[PDB]
Structures are given as structure tokens and as C-alpha cells.
């Protein structure tokens, strides 16, 4: 099924293509354009930009894009993290030229007409309310606001006061400063490399440079508490860990899977999760606990996420934190680290099974590192991680300053200091 072909053009744009010969083709344009590039004056600009695909472009009207992508059964999706924006077109392999022209019009020639932009402010409210129906969305937003001072402190969602105020000039300035060639990677699964090169030649010649150089994320170490009475309390307690793609980051991944990083068995007991066992020793109420890992280009957050009854919130949090401290005290066997490595490696290989997952991995790799590495190298990097590296990471979390975000009835929730 051929081999991944990865090249970097003189404009700095990256193009990577794997022709797997699958009936469907998937093309993603990955850009360093997340909400970490906003400042205090244009918060929510990139959220409206995420919602702004399928608006009129210089080469195709809004009706043309909607109707002409639905005609071929195609899909146009925009997925944002705090650091990246990925624009994906997926369709059958015979219709990829139409979808690629649409994608290139969307990213390189956006028009941001004032009436279409003013008729899109309502979906900021709709989109954010739908996301905030999950109690974790706002807890993670508050955790980033309380862990950072400036850059990663920015929400993926528009501030409520900024809704109805994100202007077309903010969108134009944003695209002109973040959608540049040396910040972009076009990655096609199920396409030929020369085709992607011709696509990258017909467009994507904005500046061939680095655009606006966003600020370094500054650790804050604060606490945000959202009393809202919800039956459950969601609490996140983190410290600064490491930037993505390092030996320390891999140690933090192994530590996440030592502590427990989500369930493997349906309705199970999370037996191999040491955090879960520590909490279930004393907390006989319904609960969930996992280790939380958030790695970024210039920083990272490692800690614990707990969901519990309002009454038992403190007991769950103290139990989890003391289990982490016990790992920091050098109590960590080789079998548990082998099991954690197996979990991590299996999860990594399973994430790239789908075309969406493999495309996302290749795109993030091309943005963060500017190079592609096969899963075998990733797995042996996981293998290289030693026991002392895990013990460390846990020490760094324990000794590190903490940021906390909780939501629910917090009358029994501790503070960062207690």
C-alpha cells in the first residue's frame, strides 16, 4: 500500500501523502492557528473562524460549497485544539479535486462578508452551549485559565461578551497572520504526492513565512472554582509537566498509564488503574478518576481528573493525590510499568487505525516536529522510558505548583492550598 511520502517546500509548507488505495480519500490542511494565538483583544476570533468554513470565498460562494460538497457525498470538517486548526475534506477518491479546490478556497481565499459574519455570531452561543452541556468542557477551560497567564489560558470557545463582536477585520487579520505557508502542512491519505504538490502550488502562497509569533505560555498556578450545584463535582488538579516530544513527555505518558488513563473493559473495575484502586479502597460512592496529560509545543499539564459525589469530593481527591505521592516516593514495580507501556503502545497503534486518526497524527507531527516518524520508532521511545523516569515525572508533579479547577457543589471540595 506504498509508503508515506513527506516533503517540505521552499515556502516552508509541508506536504505528506500516503496512497493506501482506499476507495475514500482524506485531505487535511493543518495550521498552527489555535486559540493560543489570540490576545485579550480578539478572544473568540478563532472559534468563529472554526465555525466560518462553508462561508463565501473568493472562488466559491457559500451555496456553491455546501451544494457542491454534498453533491459528491463529501465532508468538510474543522477540528481545533489550543495550538492547531485542521481543515479536513473527505470524499471518494474520484472527487478529491473538487473537495481540494473547496478546501483551498476556504483556507487561502476567505472573504468574511460582513452580513454572513454577523449571521454567524449566533452559532458561537449555540456551539458553546452544546459543548458546555458536558461538564468537563468548562472544567478544562477553567483549568487552562487557572494554569496559565496568557496564551494557553485562552478558551477554545468564544467569551460570552465577545459573541456578536468578533468582526470581519479580526478574522481577516487572523488568517493573514496565522494561515501562512511555514505554518501549514497539507496531508493526504489516499492521494498521490505530485497531486498534493500541484494543489500546494496553485494556492498556499500567502507569505511563505512564520506569520505572527505567538507568546510563550506562562505558568500561573491559580485556582478557578465554579459552584453550580451539579449533582457531581468535576475537579482537575494539575502541575506543569513537559512539552510534547521529549523523554520527560514520554515518562509522563507512561506515568499516565501507570496511574490509569481511562477504562479498557466495559463496566469493569479498572483493576490495573492504581489511582482507581486507591480511591475505591475508601470511597464506596460512584466515582471516576483518571490521570490527565496535556502536552503542548512549549509546555504541558499533568495531573488528576476526578468525578465524584459532592460529599465525597475531598476524599476522592486526597486519595488520588496520595497515590501519586506514593509513586513519587519510589513505590512503582517493573510489572506495573511494563503494563503501562503496553497500554500506551497499544493505544497509540489503535489511534492510527482509522484514516481520521492516522491523518491527525501525521498532521500534528508535521506541525510540531516538521518530520514524520513511523510507529516503530514511537514504540521504542516508549520502551526506552525507564522506571526512574516515571518515578521523576511523578516527583515533579508532586513537588510542582498546582492549578485546580472544580465545578459543582463545592462545599466539600478542597482548595489548592488545603
Amino acid at each position: 500500500p506504498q509508503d508515506l511520502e513527506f516533503t517540505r517546500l521552499p515556502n516552508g509548507l509541508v506536504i505528506a501523502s500516503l496512497e493506501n488505495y482506499a476507495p475514500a480519500s482524506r485531505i487535511g490542511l493543518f495550521i498552527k492557528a489555535g486559540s493560543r494565538y489570540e490576545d485579550s483583544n480578539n478572544l473568540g476570533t478563532s472559534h468563529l473562524l472554526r465555525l466560518a468554513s462553508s462561508l463565501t470565498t473568493k472562488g466559491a460562494s457559500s451555496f456553491k460549497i455546501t451544494r457542491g460538497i454534498e453533491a459528491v457525498g463529501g465532508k468538510l470538517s474543522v477540528t481545533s485544539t489550543r495550538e492547531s486548526m485542521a481543515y479536513t475534506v473527505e470524499c471518494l477518491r474520484d472527487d478529491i479535486e473538487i473537495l481540494m479546490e473547496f478546501l483551498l478556497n476556504v483556507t487561502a481565499a476567505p472573504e468574511f462578508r460582513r452580513w454572513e459574519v454577523a449571521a454567524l455570531q449566533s452559532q458561537l452561543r449555540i456551539d458553546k452551549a452544546v459543548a458546555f452541556q458536558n461538564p468537563q468542557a468548562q472544567v478544562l477551560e477553567n483549568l487552562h485559565a487557572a494554569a496559565y497567564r496568557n496564551a494557553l489560558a485562552n478558551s477554545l470557545y468564544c467569551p460570552d461578551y465577545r459573541i456578536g463582536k468578533v468582526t470581519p477585520d479580526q478574522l481577516h487579520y487572523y488568517v493573514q497572520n496565522h494561515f501562512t505557508s511555514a505554518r501549514m502542512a497539507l496531508i493526504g491519505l489516499g492521494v498521490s504526492h505530485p497531486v498534493l504538490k500541484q494543489v500546494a502550488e496553485r494556492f498556499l502562497n500567502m507569505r511563505g513565512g512564520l506569520g505572527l509569533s505567538g507568546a510563550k505560555a506562562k505558568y500561573r498556578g491559580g485556582e478557578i472554582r465554579d459552584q453550580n450545584g451539579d449533582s457531581l463535582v468535576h475537579a482537575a488538579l494539575v502541575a506543569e509537566s513537559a512539552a510534547t516530544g521529549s523523554a520527560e513527555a514520554n515518562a509522563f505518558s507512561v506515568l499516565q498509564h501507570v496511574l490509569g488513563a481511562g477504562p479498557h473493559v466495559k463496566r469493569g473495575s479498572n483493576a490495573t488503574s492504581s489511582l482507581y484502586q486507591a480511591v475505591a479502597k475508601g470511597v464506596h460512592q460512584p466515582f471516576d478518576v483518571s490521570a490527565f496529560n496535556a502536552s503542548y509545543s512549549d509546555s504541558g499539564l499533568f495531573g488528576i481528573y476526578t468525578i465524584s459525589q459532592a460529599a465525597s469530593a475531598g476524599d476522592v481527591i486526597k486519595s488520588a493525590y496520595d497515590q501519586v505521592k506514593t509513586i513519587a516516593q519510589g513505590n512503582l514495580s517493573n510489572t506495573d510499568v511494563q503494563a503501562a507501556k503496553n497500554k500506551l503502545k497499544a493505544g497509540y497503534l489503535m489511534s492510527v487505525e482509522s484514516s481520521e486518526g492516522f491523518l491527525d497524527e501525521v498532521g500534528s507531527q508535521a506541525l510540531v516536529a516538521g518530520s514524520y516518524v513511523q510507529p516503530s520508532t514511537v514504540l521504542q521511545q516508549i520502551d526506552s522510558v525507564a522506571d526512574a523516569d516515571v518515578i521523576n515525572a511523578a516527583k515533579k508533579f508532586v513537588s510542582g505548583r498546582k492549578s485546580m479547577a472544580a465545578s459543582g457543589n463545592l462545599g466539600h471540595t478542597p482548595f489548592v492550598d488545603e
Binding site: L76, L140, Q285, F287, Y296
Partner: protein, 47 residues
């Protein structure tokens, strides 16, 4: 797109309750959240 999405999006609608530890299991977050929108697909969030 062609496929409907594991979950459609009612705003102003209570989603689901969790009453058991078995249901609560997997709801804790481990990775940073991503936000996804789509022309003809339900919007999603992931953690």
C-alpha cells in the same frame, strides 16, 4: 456528510445522567479537549 454522527446536538436539552459508578467510568478526562465542527456534521468535543 453521508453519515449521521454518533450523537446529534440539541442545545437547551438535558443530555444524560450517570447514577452508577459503572456509567461514571470513562467520563473522567485524560487528554486536552479538541473542538470539531462540520459542514453537515454534528459538532463534537473531546477530552
Amino acid at each position: 456528510a453521508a453519515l449521521p454522527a454518533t450523537s446529534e446536538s440539541p442545545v437547551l436539552d438535558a443530555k444524560r445522567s450517570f447514577l452508577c459508578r459503572e456509567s461514571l467510568s470513562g467520563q473522567a478526562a485524560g487528554r486536552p479537549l479538541v473542538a470539531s465542527v462540520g459542514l453537515n456534521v454534528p459538532a463534537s468535543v473531546r477530552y
